[PDB]
């Protein structure tokens, strides 16, 4: 670290004001280092239920911050940049959900966490990339509506054998659109490397990988796989996380992939957030009341 002033002041204010700092795995290394907890969306959702502080500084994108607020309606949740969002999530609308419910009335609506809070009020259950398979398996229906990510939906259909109707038309994460050629090239360069990719990746990339999982799942792979070299097909922030957790291994990006929205949070605007205790996540009471149900069901159907 080479920003000792910013770091020391962030720590001072966090302590003075009674904040816990939660971060997603795609946040810059300097922010992961000052965070009290870093993880994927499922790990963040569980932490949001368990934590005991009354004030939360959240470092990620808006849908995630809103989930934390939904689970903690009487706590203060702040974010440094209110424009930090997921472009994929924003393409699915209430109107598309109602259209598909009318077409396939027997199918439960399973929404990825990457979805607007208004859309969550219209979901039967929420999932993350780590538990989507388990959640869909547990439901009675042989058919489900799934969105907004077509790739994760298709992965779920493969693993569960259920019919998955994806919405909207070609909803997808641009960050995870790697080329399968990139895997061919690393197999030639590193013949006993293992390739780990996200389920948001396209089918040809998933199929050529050794492992497919959420970032939380990726972090567990070196606990069971002794490979000297791992090649990682996700957003670049996870490669730092992995290097720090397993300094004895080599982690190589499959390609450079950056989520510009995840990178909106900086040391500078994080300090400003603590100085001013802004920007608070504010949601209407009715949204909190209606969206909590599919979120709590995710955990209820896990175990
Ligand atoms: S990496 Fe993709 S799915 Fe994740 S927040 Fe960024 S745009 Fe959304
Ligand atoms: Mg129905």
UniProtKB/Swiss-Prot annotation:
Cofactor note: Binds 1 [4Fe-4S] cluster per subunit.
Similarity comment: Belongs to the quinolinate synthase family. Type 2 subfamily.
Descriptive protein name: Quinolinate synthase
Keyword Membrane: no
Required cofactor names: [4Fe-4S] cluster
Major site of localization recorded for this protein: cytoplasm
Reactions catalysed: iminosuccinate + dihydroxyacetone phosphate = quinolinate + phosphate + 2 H2O + H(+)
PANTHER family the record matches: QUINOLINATE SYNTHASE, CHLOROPLASTIC, QUINOLINATE SYNTHETASE A
Annotated binding of iminosuccinate, by residue: 24, 41, 112-114, 129, 198-200, 215
One protein family per Pfam: NadA
GO biological process, one term: 'de novo' NAD biosynthetic process from L-aspartate
């Amino acid at each position: 670290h080479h920003h000792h002033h910013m770091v020391d002041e962030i720590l001072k204010l966090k302590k003075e004001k009674g904040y816990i700092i939660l971060a997603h795995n795609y946040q810059i290394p300097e922010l992961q280092d000052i965070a009290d907890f870093v993880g994927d969306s499922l790990q963040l959702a569980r932490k949001a239920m368990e934590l005991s502080e009354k004030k939360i500084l959240f470092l990620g994108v808006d849908f995630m911050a809103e989930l934390v607020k939904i689970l903690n309606p009487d706590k203060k949740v702040i974010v440094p940049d209110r424009s930090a969002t997921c472009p994929m999530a924003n393409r699915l609308t209430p109107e598309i959900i109602r259209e598909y419910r009318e077409k396939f009335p027997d199918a439960p609506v399973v929404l990825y966490v990457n979805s607007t809070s208004e859309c969550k009020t219209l979901a039967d259950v929420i999932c993350t990339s780590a538990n989507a398979v388990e959640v869909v398996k547990k439901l009675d229906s042989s058919v489900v509506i799934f969105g907004p990510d077509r790739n994760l939906g298709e992965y779920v259909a493969e693993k569960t054998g259920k019919k998955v109707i994806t919405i909207p038309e070609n909803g997808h994460c641009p960050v995870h659109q790697f080329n399968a050629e990139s895997i061919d090239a690393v197999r030639k360069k590193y013949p006993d490397a293992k390739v780990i990719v996200h389920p948001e990746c396209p089918k040809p990339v998933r199929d050529k990988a050794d492992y497919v999982g959420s970032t939380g799942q990726m972090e567990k792979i070196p606990e069971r796989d002794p490979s000297r070299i791992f090649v990682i097909g996700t957003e670049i922030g996870m490669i730092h996380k992995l290097k720090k957790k397993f300094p004895d291994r080599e982690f190589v990006p499959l390609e450079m992939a950056v989520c510009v929205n995840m990178k909106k949070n900086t040391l500078e605007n994080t300090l400003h957030a603590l100085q001013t205790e802004s920007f608070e996540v504010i949601l209407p009471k009715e949204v909190i009341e209606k969206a909590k149900k599919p979120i709590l069901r995710m955990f209820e159907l896990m175990g």
